[PDB]
């Protein structure tokens, strides 16, 4: 649950059903391709997403709002910086399970088989 998650740990958390992914790039970036399973919440929307009521989150994002007690809420962008910003923001609002995939989408693409 440390502030950064590495790719090997992330791959095992995804295979076990224990991590949720959040692509914090813009909508036009995420629409062009993302890490499989990732929910797009652009970093500029993330504060409002974490503050809004659960039913409003479901309406806008078509997924269930995370809970403060969740583990392995993994944020990422393509090169680390927005993922870091998002992780810090989420932690600051009480999401102790927020972690940054610092290697980010470019590493994901680089290490994909």
| The residue to which tokens 């610092």 are assigned | 102
> In angstroms, rounded to a whole number, what is the distance separating the alpha carbons of residues 94 and 59?
23
Domain span at residue 50 reads: 1-113
Asked if residue 68 lies in contact with residue 94, where contact means CB atoms within 8 angstroms, the answer is yes
Cβ contacts of residue 77 below 8 Å, gap of 6+? 23, 24, 25, 43, 83, 86, 104, 105
CB-CB contact of 49 with 57 (8 Å): yes
> Which residue in the list 24, 35, 73, 77 is annotated as catalytic?
77
Please state, in angstroms and rounded to a whole number, the distance separating the CA atoms of residues 71 and 19.
7
| Resolution expressed in Å | 1.0
Q: Is 77 a catalytic residue?
A: yes
Our count of domains for the chain comes to 1
């Amino acid at each position: 649950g440390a502030p950064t998650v590495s790719l090997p740990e992330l791959r095992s958390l995804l295979a076990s059903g224990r991590a949720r992914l959040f692509d914090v790039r813009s909508r036009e970036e995420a629409a062009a391709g993302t890490i499989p399973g990732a929910l797009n919440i652009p970093v500029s929307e993330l504060e409002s997403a974490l503050q809004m009521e659960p039913a409003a989150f479901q309406a806008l994002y078509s997924a269930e709002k995370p809970k403060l007690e969740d583990e392995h809420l993994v944020f990422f962008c393509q090169m680390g910086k927005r993922g870091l910003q998002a992780t810090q923001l989420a932690r600051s609002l009480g999401y102790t399970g927020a972690r940054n995939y610092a290697g980010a989408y470019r590493e994901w693409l680089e290490k994909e088989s």
